[PDB]
C-alpha cells in the first residue's frame, strides 16, 4: 500500500474530540479526499484537499493537509453517536492512471456517556433469553460452550433523551454473565 491510516480502529467516549491520521507515499501528489462509510453503504465525500488547500472547518469536522510531509488529519470536535462510522483516506497520483489509492480505513465507534449507570441482568421468555443492560461504557462485552453472547449495543430514546448499552445471551441469567466483567452493583432475579 501507499496510503496508511492510524489507528486501524479507535473506541472514543461521546463528547471527546477525535483525530484520524493518514500518511501517504503517493508521489507526485494531486488531491487527497476523506470519505465517511457506514456499514453496507457507499463511501460519502467529506472534504477534498489540493496542495494549495491546507485547512477546512466543515462544521464540527476539520480537515488538514501538509503535502511536504505527505500527511493529513481529520479532527472531529465534540463527537456523537452519529460520527460512529469507517473513515477512509483516498489519495490521487498525478501520473495519468486516474485510479485513486485507498487507505484501509479507520473504525470510529463513539460510546455514550452513561451518567446514571444502573447495571442489571433481566430474564425474558418466548411469546429463555438473558438481557444485560444499563451498564456504563467502561464495561466490556464481545461475541462469547452452548452459550452465545452478543456484542454491546447503544439505543437512543429521542423523546426522553436517554441512552443505554445492552448485550444478550441464550443457550439462569447469573450463569451467562459471570463470563464477562460485570460491575459489583448489578441487579439480578
Amino acid at each position: 500500500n501507499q496510503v496508511e491510516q492510524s489507528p486501524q480502529s479507535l473506541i472514543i467516549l461521546e463528547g471527546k474530540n477525535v483525530t484520524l491520521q493518514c500518511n501517504y507515499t503517493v508521489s507526485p501528489f494531486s488531491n487527497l479526499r476523506w470519505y465517511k462509510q457506514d456499514t453496507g453503504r457507499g463511501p460519502v465525500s467529506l472534504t477534498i484537499m489540493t496542495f494549495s488547500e491546507n485547512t477546512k472547518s466543515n462544521g464540527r469536522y476539520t480537515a488538514t493537509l501538509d503535502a511536504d510531509t505527505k500527511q493529513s488529519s481529520l479532527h472531529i470536535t465534540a463527537s456523537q453517536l452519529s460520527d460512529s462510522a469507517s473513515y477512509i483516506c483516498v489519495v490521487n497520483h498525478s501520473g495519468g492512471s486516474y485510479i485513486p489509492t485507498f487507505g484501509r480505513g479507520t473504525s470510529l465507534i463513539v460510546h455514550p456517556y452513561i451518567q446514571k449507570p444502573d447495571p442489571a441482568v433481566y430474564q425474558l421468555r418466548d411469546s429463555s433469553v438473558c438481557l444485560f443492560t444499563d451498564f456504563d461504557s467502561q464495561t466490556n462485552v464481545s461475541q462469547s460452550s452452548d452459550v452465545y453472547i452478543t456484542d454491546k449495543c447503544v439505543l437512543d430514546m429521542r423523546s426522553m433523551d436517554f441512552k443505554s448499552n445492552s448485550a444478550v445471551a441464550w443457550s439462569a441469567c447469573a450463569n451467562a454473565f459471570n463470563n464477562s466483567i460485570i460491575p459489583e452493583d448489578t441487579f439480578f432475579p
Partner: peptide
C-alpha cells in the same frame, strides 16, 4: 489549474 501549478508542478520538478 492553480492546484497543479502551486502543487503537482513543483513536485514533478523536485522529482
Amino acid at each position: 489549474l492553480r492546484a497543479y501549478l502551486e502543487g503537482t508542478c513543483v513536485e514533478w520538478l523536485r522529482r
